Amino acid sequence: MNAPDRFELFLLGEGESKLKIDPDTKAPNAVVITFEKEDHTLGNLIRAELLNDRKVLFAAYKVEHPFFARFKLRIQTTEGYDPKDALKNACNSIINKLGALKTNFETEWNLQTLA
Template sequence: MSNAPPTWELLLVPEGMKKISMEMDTKIPNAATFTVLKEDHTLGNILRMQLLKNPKVIFAGYKVPHPLEHQFILKIQTTPDTTPADVLQQEVANLIQENALTVRSMDPGDAPAAMHISARERRDF
């Protein structure tokens, strides 16, 4: 017998709740805090790294409040010519494109993309 919560509770956002919520920072200009439910360090770190590639991002960091809470808090500060929400949307779209390119490059049937990966590298996947 286990007192662990059902697995589906770790993945599904409860009805009436949003996957992502945003709160603008009142003390720091062009800064916002995003709370992302039912995700962990995997997505938090990927988003942080992708955001830091953008020259319009001054600061990007995340934390997981507690190991048993499946959520993370992402803080973003941008230059005055954009907003944290716009930058986050743009970088999520960029991550989706990068992921699609990676998946295509591993498909042996996709010759042009596969040409850039050696036979040894393909075996390692």
Template sequence: MIITDEEQRFELFLLGDDEKKCFETADTRTPNSSVFTFNKEDHTLANMLRAHLLKDPHIIFSGYKVPHPLFAKFELRIQTDGEVTPKEALLNCCKSLVTDLAILSREFTKEYELRKMVGGDSSGEK
């Protein structure tokens, strides 16, 4: 067996044996707040969730940190006004983002097909 200190890059996106993608830890220092730990994710997901959560009127705080740059992991802290739990807020956020992405996909397809029909002969060739 070769022993190496080279980083295994699939560790950036493959969950380990007993790892969960995401779990919640209650933050007891403040009311209605939780810290969600995401494994094998990076700023791609973190910043999108953070920004989208802030659009929810029930959210008082949302922010994330990457505890160490060499580990593919981030912690998202959410505090709500008490109307919804942080977990519900995060779930709503995820669902709304999935819907948004579906809209984006549809819009893009529509535009692209339109483009192909209009300018197919001139611009579609290699």
């Protein structure tokens, strides 16, 4: 009997990490990352904003199979600049932009509530 349910759909790695940090062997300074318990709702955002950054050279994510809530992501960039530093810069950009969005939303919501 051993067919998985939806508990494993989003609960983070039980006896396991959140992510793998594995170096590619086909191009200089490339690293693949395996997130799990995530999907497009993450991955597209990270890829798009990381591509918006200029110092990177390649950024693309894929999900393997919709039966599994894991997905990969490949980053290479020019020398000196670490890909992990690129990723953490990207995350900082994301947190700061949508925190601003949140603020802005409560301001306008309170304004629209008349008086």
